[PDB]
């Protein structure tokens, strides 16, 4: 079985490279952040432009939804994170304390905490209600490329250009495990599988790997794409067939069979690097987004 994703919509409106796209957990909306300092909200099913959210002084590298779909957090080159009320577009809180560009961010499942990663090589945990920093983890010795909570928020996984993935106990701040692999290629993205048992990690040697967290073992490798320069988001697609989805520096979206590691589709249509992909939580829908020469988001639909 292979998917048959086909282009349904192209979404335009950002005036610089798009950095990140995410579907709201309730399936209604797509949020996009951009080097143009703006967040935009789009209808998930029709691509209809809904609204622009502004306030960052410099470009945004990541955006993420709270679990009730009511809040967003954005990570900006202005060295802050901002928490936004989606329906009003208002900035509720500005999270200050990183001493360099903020690159990546995520809510925990309860959405009372935000985790962030920065070029200052640290990971920070923030209280959503007050906006205060709760913990700083001296997590890495290079920029932190990705941070992600597991399914019940008890663990954080962080990745870095230093070649490490590290799993942290959220509450105690203690590093429980470090994944190290051979020649230490920079790690550009990382995230837990939906069941919390595996970690998908992208490295800047054109490689994606699926690790068993408990055993510290690489179980699967996925190749064929180009990824040497950018921190490209990758996903587990679970609504239909079990795929791995990623962008690529050859302007294609790659879809792999998770178990066999075979490439099952390449989505063509972007005209610059596909920096970001997202999978819809209930439909077989992929959103993809691309850099300066393109600046658009594409929505793709499959029957499986």
């Amino acid at each position: 079985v292979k998917p048959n994703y086909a282009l349904k919509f192209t979404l335009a409106g950002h005036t610089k490279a798009v950095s990140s796209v995410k579907f709201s957990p309730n399936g209604e909306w797509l949020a996009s952040s951009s080097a143009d300092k703006l967040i935009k909200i789009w209808g998930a099913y029709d691509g209809k432009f809904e609204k622009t959210i502004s306030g960052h002084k410099l470009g945004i590298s990541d955006v993420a939804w709270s679990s009730d779909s009511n809040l967003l957090v954005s990570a900006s080159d202005d060295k802050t994170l901002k928490i936004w009320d989606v329906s009003s577009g208002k900035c509720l809180k500005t999270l200050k304390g990183h001493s360099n560009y903020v690159f990546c961010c995520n809510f925990n499942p309860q959405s009372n905490l935000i985790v962030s990663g920065s070029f200052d090589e640290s990971v920070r945990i923030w209280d959503v209600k007050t906006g205060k920093c709760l913990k700083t983890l001296p997590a890495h010795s290079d920029p932190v490329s990705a941070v992600h909570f597991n399914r019940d928020g008890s663990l954080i996984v962080s990745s870095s250009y230093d070649g490490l993935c590290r799993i942290w106990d959220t509450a105690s701040g203690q590093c429980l495990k470090t994944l190290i692999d051979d020649d230490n290629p920079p790690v550009s993205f990382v995230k837990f599988s939906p069941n919390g048992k595996y970690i998908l990690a992208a490295t800047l040697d054109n490689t994606l790997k699926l690790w068993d967290y408990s055993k510290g073992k690489c179980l699967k490798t996925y190749t064929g794409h180009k990824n040497e320069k950018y921190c490209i988001f990758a996903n587990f697609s679970v609504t239909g067939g079990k795929w791995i989805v990623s962008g690529s520096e050859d302007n294609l979206v790659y879809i792999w069979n998770l178990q066999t590691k075979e490439i099952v589709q390449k989505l063509q249509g972007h005209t610059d690097v596909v920096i970001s992909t997202a999978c819809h939580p209930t439909e077989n829908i992929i959103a993809s987004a691309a850099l300066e020469n393109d600046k658009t988001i594409k929505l793709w639909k499959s029957d499986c």
Binding site: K16, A17, V18, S19, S20, S33, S34, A35, L58, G59, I60, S61, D62, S76, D77, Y101, F103, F119, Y161, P186, S188, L204, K229, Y230, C231, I275, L291, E292
Partner: peptide, 8 residues
């Protein structure tokens, strides 16, 4: 300008 959208 965003660090994610610039090459490493």
């Amino acid at each position: 300008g965003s660090m994610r959208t610039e090459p490493r």
